[PDB]
Amino acid sequence: KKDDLFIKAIQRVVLMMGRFVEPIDDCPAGNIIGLVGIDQFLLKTGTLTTSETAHNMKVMKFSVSPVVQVAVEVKNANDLPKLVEGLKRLSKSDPCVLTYMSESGEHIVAGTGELHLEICLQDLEHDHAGVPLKISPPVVAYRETVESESSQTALSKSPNKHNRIYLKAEPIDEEVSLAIENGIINPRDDFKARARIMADDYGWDVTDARK
Amino acid sequence: AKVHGSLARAGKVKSQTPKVEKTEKPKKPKGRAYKRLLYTRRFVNVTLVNGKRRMNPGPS
């Protein structure tokens, strides 16, 4: 597949010695070497080759996973887009942190531990952003569910006071709930086809499955 | 009026469209050749000149 293959070149080659950096004309195999010009399109890890038949080295599991979460938000509504980009900038800088947006519409940085959060806050304070940040414990995405088979058939008179809607509420089998997300019971499926597969393999009646 | 827009069912027709695969067609000559055949197709063997010259008439 043509996925994520970047046909580019090299801007400069550098061998590092302390903070000083110098251009390099060529570097043979089996050597530590640095280089520029690909940092913008790089994903903080990967394989660099001059061919498509070569393969990608195994993704380092890090053996240490980014787990601890803390929210991050902007001081000003006008300032929201300015330092929202810096999340990607820091994510490149360290090969573990994964900046994303949580299910609460809120941006979460996930670190390995406590002080790994410490290292990535002064850069947002000073280096990768200038605006201060409000740092708060993360908000989690709960949800509300029932199992207790609501007795009275619910009903609500429409604003016209002409129509009403009768209805009932009751639970769902847990594997069905997974299957709704897992796509086995898929809205893209035909109503007929999806009704057959959910009525027999999973506990359902063909009458309701067709509805 | 109505302002409580419902967006969950966006993409309704596309997400329910019957996915039909493109029918393979013989390779189309093009360039001077296309203008050649296009000129001929509309000035020598015009399949439908019914009533008047017609470019895209269906089954009728």
Partner: protein, 144 residues
Amino acid sequence: GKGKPRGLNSARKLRVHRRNNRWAENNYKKRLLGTAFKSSPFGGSSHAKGIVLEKLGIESKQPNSAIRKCVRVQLIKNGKKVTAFVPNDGCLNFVDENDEVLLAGFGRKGKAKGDIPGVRFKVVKVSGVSLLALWKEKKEKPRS
């Protein structure tokens, strides 16, 4: 007759008259007020990058009956909060809130187009990949 100064050396009264009457053109007045630079979501720019705030569903104008699936977007360069209409079928599922999008002009020098009320921009590229390419499955949205 004809109600205009017509002397051989009356060009002063003729030039100041045209100069004064020129202001009644809507297009000329915009240039000489700099309203595009001063009073506009775009400072004369043809496009602009923005960050999504919310995905809005707007009723169309009469007699049309549709929901237009716009996105409330903040402009990076001036912070103005606007709306943009995401074209083509779906393509609102293509974008997510708090993502990066490119907003272009929407066709009519202002003048909100079509049955869609209160929106004057359309989305072109989201996160750097063209929405049209995503619609035709030419490319895909990188997870960053």
